[PDB]
Design a protein around this ligand. Structure first.
Ligand SMILES: *[C@@H]1O[C@H](CO[C@@H]2O[C@@H](C)[C@@H](O)[C@@H](O)[C@@H]2O)[C@@H](O[C@@H]2O[C@H](CO)[C@@H](O[C@@H]3O[C@H](CO[C@H]4O[C@H](CO)[C@@H](O)[C@H](O)[C@@H]4O)[C@@H](O)[C@H](O[C@H]4O[C@H](CO)[C@@H](O)[C@H](O)[C@@H]4O)[C@@H]3O)[C@H](O)[C@H]2NC(C)=O)[C@H](O)[C@H]1NC(C)=O
Ligand SMILES: CCCCCCCCCNC(=O)CCC[C@@H](O)[C@@H](O)[C@H](CO[C@H]1O[C@H](CO)[C@H](O)[C@H](O)[C@H]1O)NC(=O)CCCCCCC
Ligand SMILES: *[C@@H]1O[C@H](CO)[C@@H](O[C@@H]2O[C@H](CO)[C@@H](O)[C@H](O)[C@H]2NC(C)=O)[C@H](O)[C@H]1NC(C)=O
Ligand SMILES: CCCCCCCCCCCCCCCC(=O)O
Ligand SMILES: *[C@@H]1O[C@H](CO)[C@@H](O)[C@H](O)[C@H]1NC(C)=O
Lengths: 98, 267
């Protein structure tokens, strides 16, 4: 079993009040069954688009989640991943620069 | 150098549950999706059919339709025969296709529980050094199936290069698309850490460097290439610096799409 690495980054320069796209890229996991949510202020965002799961040269799986977002200085955004390799869900908050 | 990969993922959960899903990639652009849910192979591009006629495509599709059911039956049946020694859950991955050259080489690799165990090479299937010894007998059996060996050899040696040359022609404008990067700077709010962000570029080759005037700052750490959802790439390059030394620094970007007019962001 392999633990998912999680990276969160924005499609365009994050400018407050401008609509944008936030990406959550989950990598290096096995087995492929996995549950990925993106969060605004700690709540599940409803419309989260997902790429088809694929895998790398080393056979580890990867997948890209993405959703529309508008950054402001009153909002946090995160990506929570549940997977058999980890006891509890792992969450990565958006760096705010990325 | 374009590498065509068909990536098959099979999960077997217990005896009454399994799914097989596939995705196909020409280089870094996804060309096909084949969900367990669907009887047919779906296109993720307008040119996903290559130069194959509607009939020629259906014949190839049928062959893979037959394969998927047969493969599932065979793995289910192997597990019953080996029980309780080999038992659920089981994950099988196949990576198969061909790497084109100015000429091509083909491959078919199989992983079991995340480890590479089996390949097709030449005229036969074979386990690889260090594979579990219980795979040797099932692979010998499979190697007796002459017709399967012959179809696999056709598929690897001939069909794959022929079909990909069809994709390279049919999807030329899409494969040779130029998308421009946008960049922006940030830092961790002791020595600071400057981050130059570069998103939206295609194709993959790119150059990102921190600069002071014309001097490349060789402490520049290049991050991994992260995909965007719109078939463009994301990359960041960071530099660890002392405070007060950030004046006069800049991030310089070069990319094919920019036509020699580099991006320069002064800190
Ligand atoms: C498809 O292409 C195959 C080769 O390409 C590789 O595999 C495919 C799947 C791709 O992944 C591609 O990227 C790879 O490069 C091709 O396989 C070849 O088929 C012939 C038989 O038709 C084999 O020839 C036999 O060779 C053996 C010796 O093999 C050993 O030694 C050589 C080194 O000299 C190594 O290359 C091998 O790895 C082995 O270690 C001979 O013993 C044998 O000679 C005897 O039998 C023949 C009858 O066939 C008589 O004429 C002779 O006089 C002898 O009595 C063969 O000559 C060849 O080994 C095999 N290549 C490999 C690498 O295994 C396959 O045939 C293609 N099929 C089609 C339908 O196109
Ligand atoms: C536990 C981890 C083990 C992983 C290692 C084992 C991997 C085994 C992989 N096996 C296969 O890919 C083949 C499975 C299907 C095959 O065994 C046959 O059942 C199937 C049907 O064969 C019969 O009909 C064919 C005509 O349809 C031929 O005439 C054949 O002679 C006859 O026996 N074979 C196929 O579907 C062959 C074509 C698909 C091959 C594609 C491989 C990616
Ligand atoms: C994956 O896809 C195949 C589609 O063929 C499913 O296989 C069928 O499974 C159902 C069980 O609900 C049976 O009624 C059929 O006999 C099966 N069909 C064939 C052709 O074998 C399979 O169930 C799917 N798996 C999941 C998890 O959805
Ligand atoms: C196995 C080598 C394939 C060579 C032929 C390539 C052109 C046909 C593309 C078929 C894509 C179907 C995806 C299923 C992949 C699989 O299950 O192995
Ligand atoms: C088989 O596996 C599925 C998915 O893991 C599970 O939900 C189901 O309960 C299992 N069925 C049986 C009959 O054991």
């Amino acid at each position: 079993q392999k633990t998912p690495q999680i990276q969160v980054y924005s499609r365009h320069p994050p400018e407050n009040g401008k609509p944008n796209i936030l990406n959550c890229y989950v990598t290096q996991f096995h087995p492929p069954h996995i549950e990925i949510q993106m969060l605004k202020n700690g709540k599940k965002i409803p419309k989260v688009e997902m790429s088809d799961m694929s895998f790398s040269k080393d056979w580890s799986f990867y997948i890209l989640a993405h959703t529309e977002f508008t950054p402001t200085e009153t909002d946090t955004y995160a990506c929570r991943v549940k997977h058999a390799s980890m006891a509890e869900p792992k969450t990565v908050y958006w760096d705010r620069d990325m | 150098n374009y590498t065509f990969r068909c990536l098959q993922m099979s999960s077997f959960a217990n005896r009454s549950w399994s799914r097989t899903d596939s995705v196909v990639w020409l280089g870094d652009l996804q060309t096909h999706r084949w969900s367990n849910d669907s009887a047919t192979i779906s296109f993720t591009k307008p040119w996903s059919q290559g130069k194959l006629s509607n009939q020629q495509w259906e014949k190839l599709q049928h062959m893979f339709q037959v394969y998927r059911v047969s493969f599932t039956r065979d793995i289910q049946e192997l597990v019953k025969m080996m029980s309780p020694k080999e038992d659920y859950p089981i994950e099988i991955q196949l990576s198969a296709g061909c790497e084109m050259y100015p000429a091509s080489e083909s491959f078919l690799h199989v992983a079991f529980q995340g480890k590479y165990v089996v390949r097709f090479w030449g005229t036969s299937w074979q386990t690889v050094p260090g594979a579990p010894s219980w795979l040797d007998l099932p692979i010998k059996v499979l190697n007796a199936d002459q017709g399967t060996s012959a179809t696999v050899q056709m598929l690897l040696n001939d069909t794959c290069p022929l079909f990909v040359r069809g994709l390279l022609e049919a999807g030329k404008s899409d494969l040779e698309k130029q998308e421009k990067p946008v960049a922006w700077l940030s830092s961790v709010p002791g020595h600071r850490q400057l981050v130059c962000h570069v998103s939206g570029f295609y194709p993959k080759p790119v150059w990102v460097m921190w600069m002071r005037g014309d001097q490349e700052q060789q402490g520049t750490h290049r991050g991994d290439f992260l995909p965007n959802a719109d078939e463009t790439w994301y990359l960041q390059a960071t530099l660890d610096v002392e405070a007060g030394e950030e004046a006069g620094l800049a991030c310089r970007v070069k990319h094919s799409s920019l036509g020699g007019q580099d991006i320069i962001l002064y800190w």
